[PDB]
Amino acid sequence: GPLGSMFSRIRLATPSDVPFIHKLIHQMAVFERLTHLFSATESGLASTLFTSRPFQSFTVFLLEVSRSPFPATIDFTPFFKTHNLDLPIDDPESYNFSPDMLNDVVVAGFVLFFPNYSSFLSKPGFYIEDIFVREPYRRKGFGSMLLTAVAKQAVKMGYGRVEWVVLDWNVNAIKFYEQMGAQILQEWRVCRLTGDALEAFDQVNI
Amino acid sequence: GPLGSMFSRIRLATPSDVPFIHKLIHQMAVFERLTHLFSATESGLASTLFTSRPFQSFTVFLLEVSRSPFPATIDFTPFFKTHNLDLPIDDPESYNFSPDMLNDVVVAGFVLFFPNYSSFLSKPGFYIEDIFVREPYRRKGFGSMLLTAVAKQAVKMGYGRVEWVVLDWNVNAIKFYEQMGAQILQEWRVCRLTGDALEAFDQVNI
Numbered sequence: 426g427p428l429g430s431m432f433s434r435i436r437l438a439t440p441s442d443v444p445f446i447h448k449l450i451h452q453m454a455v456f457e458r459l460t461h462l463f464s465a466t467e468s469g470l471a472s473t474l475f476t477s478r479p480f481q482s483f484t485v486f487l488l489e490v491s492r493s494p495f496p497a498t499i500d501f502t503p504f505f506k507t508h509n510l511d512l513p514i515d516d517p518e519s520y521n522f523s524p525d526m527l528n529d530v531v532v533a534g535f536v537l538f539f540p541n542y543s544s545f546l547s548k549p550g551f552y553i554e555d556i557f558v559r560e561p562y563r564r565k566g567f568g569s570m571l572l573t574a575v576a577k578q579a580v581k582m583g584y585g586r587v588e589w590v591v592l593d594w595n596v597n598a599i600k601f602y603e604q605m606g607a608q609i610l611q612e613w614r615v616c617r618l619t620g621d622a623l624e625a626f627d628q629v630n631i
Numbered sequence: 632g633p634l635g636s637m638f639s640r641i642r643l644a645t646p647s648d649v650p651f652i653h654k655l656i657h658q659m660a661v662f663e664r665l666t667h668l669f670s671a672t673e674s675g676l677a678s679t680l681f682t683s684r685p686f687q688s689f690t691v692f693l694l695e696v697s698r699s700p701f702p703a704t705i706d707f708t709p710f711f712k713t714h715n716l717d718l719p720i721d722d723p724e725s726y727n728f729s730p731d732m733l734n735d736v737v738v739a740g741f742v743l744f745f746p747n748y749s750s751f752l753s754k755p756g757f758y759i760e761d762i763f764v765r766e767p768y769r770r771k772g773f774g775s776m777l778l779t780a781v782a783k784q785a786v787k788m789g790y791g792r793v794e795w796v797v798l799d800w801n802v803n804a805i806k807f808y809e810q811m812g813a814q815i816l817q818e819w820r821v822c823r824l825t826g827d828a829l830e831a832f833d834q835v836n837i
């Protein structure tokens with residue numbers, strides 16, 4: 426009949442997850458219309474994302490789903506949840522996000538984040554560089570669980586804020602963020618030094 | 632006669648510098664018209680800013696000036712520079728920023744920053760939370776030296792970008808940043824979860 430049962434898990438990524446992280450970021454570059462900025466490599470992620478313990482620096486939570494439940498127990502333990510969703514999900518790219526041949530596990534989303542600092546609170550926070558759910562799985566609460574995971578971690582460590590940026594035009598994301606209780610601030614603009622501009626400072630003698 | 636000699640030093644802050652850091656942040660809250668957000672304490676900065684080695688996490692460079700030169704040598708060594716500036720500087724609040732009675736050293740500015748991550752480059756960068764020069768010392772190149780110090784560090788560690796935010800209206804800062812070669816991006820807006828909004832996620836069971 427119409428509905429079916431589905432299992433979800435949110436866990437920390439390991440370096441072995443780099444292929445799926447890479448692909449998710451790519452899909453974000455496509456959605457953001459910023460593929461011209463996308464030069465990420467798998468070896469780059471593997472080399473730079475995991476040089477510290479989780480939560481101390483760059484950290485990733487992965488969301489996986491499955492029709493079969495996960496194994497028992499394999500500063501954080503995974504969140505598990507059981508969903509009643511509709512018939513099968515149409516996910517053509519499923520094979521691109523499957524850790525295993527003999528397996529119906531699929532990576533459905535992620536969040537990538539790290540400690541920032543609020544000057545004015547004298548308190549660390551978390552900044553979310555990426556949060557993303559693949560198209561087939563949207564509007565089912567998964568983005569909520571991902572943001573909730575980071576928020577809870579922040580409250581647990583007594584951090585002052587969680588922050589990120591959103592595109593001007595991205596109405597759907599903005600409604601999501603406001604529904605989660607975020608304020609969209611109008612007064613700040615991002616400033617960036619990069620490329621030749623950055624490199625030029627290597628010669629400057631002051 | 633009109634001009635005089637002046638010595639500058641840029642060094643890493645230690646926890647002992649917290650009083651001056653606190654006061655600088657306060658002046659920024661005043662300038663930004665955001666004193667209503669200012670709840671920083673000295674004990675908060677001392678407790679949260681120095682839990683890691685420099686450059687691994689939250690890091691501060693202080694700018695000090697003096698009419699007398701600094702002592703000899705007391706991943707980084709301090710930058711020193713000699714300036715020919717005009718008569719005395721009128722600095723009423725000088726005593727608030729002086730490390731020592733018997734001493735004409737004064738803290739004139741700072742930058743507070745930490746590692747961020749560019750998804751799309753798969754490369755860490757630095758994010759500047761604060762950069763500031765006190766009023767009496769502006770338009771003398773000191774902001775340039777401060778930004779240069781962070782930029783050089785980034786190039787040395789092979790980071791992809793240096794970034795920060797600027798207020799909408801802050802024409803003088805924007806001209807400064809553009810002169811340094813930064814691009815001011817128009818499309819990003821900052822999103823923030825904080826206060827009760829953040830705390831509420833402590834009860835949420837998902």
Ligand SMILES: CC(=O)SCCNC(=O)CCNC(=O)[C@H](O)C(C)(C)COP(=O)(O)OP(=O)(O)OC[C@H]1O[C@@H](n2cnc3c(N)ncnc32)[C@H](O)[C@@H]1OP(=O)(O)O
Binds near residue numbers: 457557558559570
């Ligand atoms: C660079 C940028 O500007 S954005 C980069 C990432 N943002 C993106 O837009 C990428 C593409 N989209 C996504 O990844 C996802 O849609 C997310 C992460 C934004 C949201 O995650 P989802 O799992 O789709 O959202 P979730 O189901 O948890 O939605 C929570 C609530 O948001 C609110 N909401 C309102 N409008 C919307 C909307 N258009 N889309 C999603 N949620 C919405 C609803 O109250 C919803 O609850 P409901 O399903 O009962 O109506």
Ligand SMILES: CC(=O)SCCNC(=O)CCNC(=O)[C@H](O)C(C)(C)COP(=O)(O)OP(=O)(O)OC[C@H]1O[C@@H](n2cnc3c(N)ncnc32)[C@H](O)[C@@H]1OP(=O)(O)O
Binds near residue numbers: 663768774
């Ligand atoms: C939240 C926000 O939006 S901003 C928070 C921090 N920003 C602030 O505005 C705080 C108050 N101001 C300051 O702290 C300082 O003015 C800074 C940090 C912005 C700049 O540092 P300074 O030491 O004043 O700048 P510096 O002397 O290095 O200026 C470099 C170049 O910027 C360019 N520039 C152009 N217009 C300006 C301007 N109005 N102010 C400063 N530099 C300017 C010039 O080319 C200048 O070189 P020049 O002196 O030969 O003309």
